[PDB]
């Protein structure tokens, strides 16, 4: 009579997006989170025979493969498997009700879905559609799991925030519209991953690595700055902002990311630290990495990996103009929330990511992730960039005496507490300032604080 084929498929988009907590994006697309199943209605040309077989196929990226977990083939089943799976929940005439699930280890990104039918000793194959798959912070087994509901709403679902600024004397704040839900922004942030060096040099590997928030996170720390890769923002601290916008003139991420796209992925002029941190925050919250913005007053820039900010004098008092070490009035970066399978169970939670081009890391302006817990314990041999970030929050300022004749130098004074003050992020639910200094280091003036500093100096 006729072979089994698909008439139409209802993705039940509204319903699934609500369940997957993606209902807030301004988009007509099916946006999903990994690990969580979704339900679809598939209207066939007939009932299922008990000799016929349906096979689902999903792929993401340009060189998808089973081995790399970027393509999957799975039968319509009654058995719930481990990986990708499709469960037949009911048949009603020609209509099948199907529950499809993704692994909690699946690469995030855009996927294509196809169905392959074996019937009447023949094989057919049709494209069903496409969807977006994000990280899933509601899912206890996802690496980005954040169990507390209030915290999740803040650090994922909140599209407006507050960055602290100024100096120790005079702390202020500015509003920032993260704007992750506005039109095209989720899409642009996905674009970013497809334009990294990582991807340009080995797309197949890059896309397989998108299952991992450590990887996605660090790529973003590179790609949000123009350096190296034609990323989103170009920094300028000259004071003269000719040929572009004054950094103090941006109010959020949306203009920036759009202007980047519209110029054909050409850098946007110009940004400073808070502008990098705010734009990176949009990207992180978009993709499902809970994140927030951190400000640090008296932030050290150490330029020689010794955990100290060095000033230099002749033994007579005259100041020798040597060293590059400096200290900012304030600096701003991001923390993202994930477990660290590369490090150990004791190192999960908040991870520093910094898109402001200060120092290079494996030749590139990138920075993090760095276990905040790690930084506090002085465990600075760990990945990534932990000496730089230790210096930022807990450098000692040292004045040195240098004898030109003999080339001897020695310590003169040490100031062990001027660096890293009033470290700050927006409150959950309100616009109050949380202090998180004690999360980054032991209490200034204490014993432990000095014994870490020592530990850390020996870990270099």
């Amino acid at each position, epitope marked *: 009579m006729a072979a089994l084929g698909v008439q139409s498929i209802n993705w039940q988009t509204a319903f699934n997006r609500q369940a997957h907590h993606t209902d807030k994006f301004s988009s007509q697309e099916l946006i999903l989170r990994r690990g969580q199943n979704f339900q679809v209605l598939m209207i066939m040309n007939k009932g299922l025979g008990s000799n016929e077989r349906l096979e689902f196929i999903v792929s993401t990226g340009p060189y998808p493969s089973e081995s790399a977990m970027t393509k999957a083939v799975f039968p319509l089943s009654n058995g719930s498997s481990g990986g990708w799976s499709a469960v037949l929940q009911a048949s009603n005439g020609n209509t099948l009700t199907i529950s499809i699930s993704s692994p909690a280890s699946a690469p995030i990104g855009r996927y294509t879905m196809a169905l392959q039918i074996f019937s009447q000793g023949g094989i057919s194959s049709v494209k069903l559609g496409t969807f977006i798959l994000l990280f899933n912070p509601w899912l206890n087994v996802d690496s980005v799991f954040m169990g507390n509901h209030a915290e999740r709403e803040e650090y994922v679902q909140e599209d407006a925030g507050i960055i602290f600024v100024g100096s120790t004397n005079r702390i202020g704040m500015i509003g920032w519209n993260f704007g992750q839900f506005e039109e095209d922004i989720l899409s642009i942030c996905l674009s970013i991953l497809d334009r990294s060096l990582n991807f340009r040099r080995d797309a197949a590997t890059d896309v397989a690595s998108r299952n991992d928030p450590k990887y996605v996170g660090r790529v973003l720390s590179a790609m949000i700055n123009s350096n190296d890769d034609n990323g989103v923002l170009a920094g300028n601290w000259s004071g003269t902002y000719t040929g572009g916008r004054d950094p103090r003139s941006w109010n959020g991420s949306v203009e920036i990311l759009k202007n980047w796209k519209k110029s054909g992925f050409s850098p946007v002029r110009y940004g400073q630290c808070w502008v990098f941190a705010g734009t990176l925050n949009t990207a992180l919250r978009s993709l499902g990495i809970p994140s927030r913005v951190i400000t640090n007053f008296n932030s050290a820039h150490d330029t020689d990996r010794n955990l100290s900010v060095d000033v230099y004098y*002749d*033994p*007579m008092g*005259n100041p*020798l*103009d*040597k060293g590059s070490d400096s200290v900012w009035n304030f600096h701003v970066w991001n923390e993202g929330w994930f477990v660290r399978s590369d490090l150990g169970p004791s190192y999960g939670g908040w991870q520093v990511l910094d898109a402001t081009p200060q120092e290079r890391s494996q030749g590139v302006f990138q920075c993090g992730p760095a276990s905040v817990i790690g930084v506090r314990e002085g465990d600075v041999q760990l990945n990534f960039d932990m000496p730089f970030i230790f210096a930022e929050v807990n450098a000692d300022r040292i004045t040195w*005496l240098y004898d*030109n*004749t*003999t080339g*001897k130098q*020695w310590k003169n004074s040490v100031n062990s507490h001027t660096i890293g003050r009033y470290i700050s992020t927006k409150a959950v639910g309100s616009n109050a300032r949380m202090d998180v200094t004690d999360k980054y280091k032991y209490p200034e003036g204490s014993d432990q604080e000095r014994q870490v500093f020592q530990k850390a100096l020996g870990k270099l």
Partner: antibody, heavy 118, light 113 residues
């Protein structure tokens, strides 16, 4: 006022080992930033700087003579010792110790003369 | 490395005349960071050790008569004795302390009479 006095064997036979001792008064080699050094002057010739020790027992030597030289201080006795090996007649000279702080070598001993002879 | 070359090699001035003594350096002994000249001048009377007249090219040590003045910068330096007394007869050495210590060969100064 500062003063320094050298002391040790005046005579010293070839391929032996010279040991000189500087005794000083009117400063401490325990003060930060302070150094004592040695110089020698062969009969009718130019002064040659030999070595230098700091308060924290950092040291520097003439690069040409490093292998022969040794400098120690005994800060309890206000004394600094010099050890030159393989004394040949070429090394017959007057041997000075000197104080140093921030400047050059500002205050010198009277100097003791050292003869290398069988 | 650094080599100190004095001129002249010897010198006789009449009592109360000006005596000039020069020193040249292999290299600049001027540290760019403090803009100070690491050069010194000594005097050596017979039977005595050298006595330091002048550090930093030009600053004179506590207690030294005003008639001794030091000039120069970089690699060319000059020790001037404005009015030579009978008791100034001696050997004048220049010295660099930019990189460890090296001395000039010395210049002998006598009274022409």
């Amino acid at each position: 006022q500062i003063t320094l006095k050298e002391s040790g064997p005046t005579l010293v036979k070839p391929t032996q080992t010279l040991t000189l001792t500087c005794t000083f008064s009117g400063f401490s080699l325990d003060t930060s930033g302070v150094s004592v050094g040695w110089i020698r002057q062969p009969p009718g010739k130019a002064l040659e700087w030999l070595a230098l020790i700091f308060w924290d027992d950092d040291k520097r030597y003439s690069p040409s003579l490093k292998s022969r030289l040794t400098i120690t201080k005994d800060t309890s006795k206000n004394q600094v010792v010099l050890t030159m090996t393989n004394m040949e007649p070429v090394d017959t000279a007057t041997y000075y110790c000197a104080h140093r702080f921030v400047g050059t070598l500002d205050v010198w001993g009277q100097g003791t003369t050292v003869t290398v002879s069988s | 490395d650094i080599v100190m070359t004095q001129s002249p090699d010897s010198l006789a001035v009449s009592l109360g005349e000006r005596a000039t003594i020069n020193c040249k350096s292999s290299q600049s002994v001027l540290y760019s960071s403090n803009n100070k000249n690491y050069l010194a001048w000594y005097q050596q009377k017979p039977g005595q050790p050298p006595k330091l007249l002048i550090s930093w090219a030009s600053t004179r040590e506590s207690g030294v008569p005003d008639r001794f003045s030091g000039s120069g910068s970089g690699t060319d330096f000059t020790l001037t004795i404005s009015s030579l007394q009978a008791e100034d007869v001696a050997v004048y050495y220049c010295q660099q302390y930019y990189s460890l210590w090296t001395f000039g060969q010395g210049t002998k100064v006598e009274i022409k009479r």
